[PDB]
């Protein structure tokens, strides 16, 4: 009954730009913030935890500090949108949006990051 | 808040033995089966899915059929206990118990499998 869907399972973004990863879940009538739980994570590193209508950055992995936010306006439309500003090469990998809202589901989203030689060279060292 | 806790985040088991990995969640009074969702997985392979008060093996990976059980007696005590009999080296890796019940959380559990040379040689192909 409850299915999470992702329009894009793959994103190809540029180094230093901003990215928005979308993750859709059904909302029948009006959004029950008390029943919504949203988890954004990549490779066992927690990015976002949204419970009771507020972000919890107490468990956010340090590499995503000051750069990751959940677009709360899109939530009432059934869209868990993760925005990452200043995309780094470390941001490449497999992301997971986990959503609980009556039912529970999750989806994987792969991010590849293109970079110029200088940025890639610094990441390599 | 609603938090899933695991007594042991690491299990060290012997090849061919049976293991039971525990995953605790709070129950206010008596377990409301209609509101409970239990998801067990290791490394993107589904082991157990408990929805609507019934096991769902429709997405269970073939390796875990007839070899994995959710102890339903422990569920009413707030313990989603996954029992895997005849542990193989392929069972080593990162497990996740995902639980939705008036809230949502999950925990990771690492299983290491000790095996004699013969079992390792067979796994080695
Ligand atoms: C999320 C969750 C639960 O979940 C239940 C469930 N039902 N079903 C599934 S498994 C989906 C699946 C399978 C295989 C491959 C994928 C990857 N998606 C691919 C598609 O192949 C892609 O689009 O790239 C995806 O879990 C259960 C309990 C709690 C929670 C929760 C915890 C914390 C926060 C919020 C909620």
UniProtKB/Swiss-Prot annotation, chains A, B:
Disulfide cross-links: 23-97
Domain Ig-like V-type: from-to ranges: 2-110
Cellular localisation: Cell membrane; Early endosome membrane; Recycling endosome membrane; Nucleus
Description of post-translational modifications: Ubiquitinated; STUB1 likely mediates polyubiquitination of PD-L1/CD274 triggering its degradation. Ubiquitinated by MARCHF8; leading to degradation. Deubiquitinated by USP22; leading to stabilization.
Residues that carry a glycan: 18
Tissue specificity annotation: Highly expressed in the heart, skeletal muscle, placenta and lung. Weakly expressed in the thymus, spleen, kidney and liver. Expressed on activated T- and B-cells, dendritic cells, keratinocytes and monocytes.
Record's note on what induces expression: Up-regulated on T- and B-cells, dendritic cells, keratinocytes and monocytes after LPS and IFNG activation. Up-regulated in B-cells activated by surface Ig cross-linking.
Family indicated by similarity: Belongs to the immunoglobulin superfamily. BTN/MOG family.
Disease annotated for this entry: Truncation of the 3'-untranslated (3'-UTR) region of CD274 transcripts leads to elevated expression of CD274 in multiple cancers including T-cell leukemia, diffuse large B-cell lymphoma and stomach adenocarcinoma. Disruption of 3'-UTR region is caused by structural variants that stabilize CD274 transcripts, leading to overexpression. Increased expression in tumors promotes immune evasion and tumor cell growth by allowing malignant cells to escape destruction by the immune system.
Subunit structure: Interacts with PDCD1. Interacts (via transmembrane domain) with CMTM4 and CMTM6. Interacts with (phosphorylated) STAT3; promoting nuclear translocation. Interacts with CD80.
The protein's role, per its UniProt record: Plays a critical role in induction and maintenance of immune tolerance to self. As a ligand for the inhibitory receptor PDCD1/PD-1, modulates the activation threshold of T-cells and limits T-cell effector response. Through a yet unknown activating receptor, may costimulate T-cell subsets that predominantly produce interleukin-10 (IL10). Can also act as a transcription coactivator: in response to hypoxia, translocates into the nucleus via its interaction with phosphorylated STAT3 and promotes transcription of GSDMC, leading to pyroptosis.
Protein name: Programmed cell death 1 ligand 1
Organism: Homo sapiens
Taxonomic lineage from the root: Eukaryota, Metazoa, Chordata, Craniata, Vertebrata
């Amino acid at each position: 009954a409850f299915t999470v869907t992702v329009p894009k399972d793959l994103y190809v973004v540029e180094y230093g730009s901003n990215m928005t990863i979308e993750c859709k879940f059904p909302v029948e009538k009006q959004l029950d913030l008390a029943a919504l739980i949203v988890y954004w994570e990549m490779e066992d590193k927690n990015i976002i935890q949204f419970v009771h209508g507020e972000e919890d950055l107490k468990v956010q992995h340090s590499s995503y500090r000051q750069r990751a936010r959940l677009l709360k306006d899109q939530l009432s439309l059934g869209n868990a949108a993760l925005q990452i500003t200043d995309v780094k090469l470390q941001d490449a990998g497999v992301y997971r949006c986990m959503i609980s809202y009556g039912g529970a589901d999750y989806k994987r989203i792969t991010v590849k990051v293109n970079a110029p030689y200088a940025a890639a060279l610094e990441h390599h060292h």
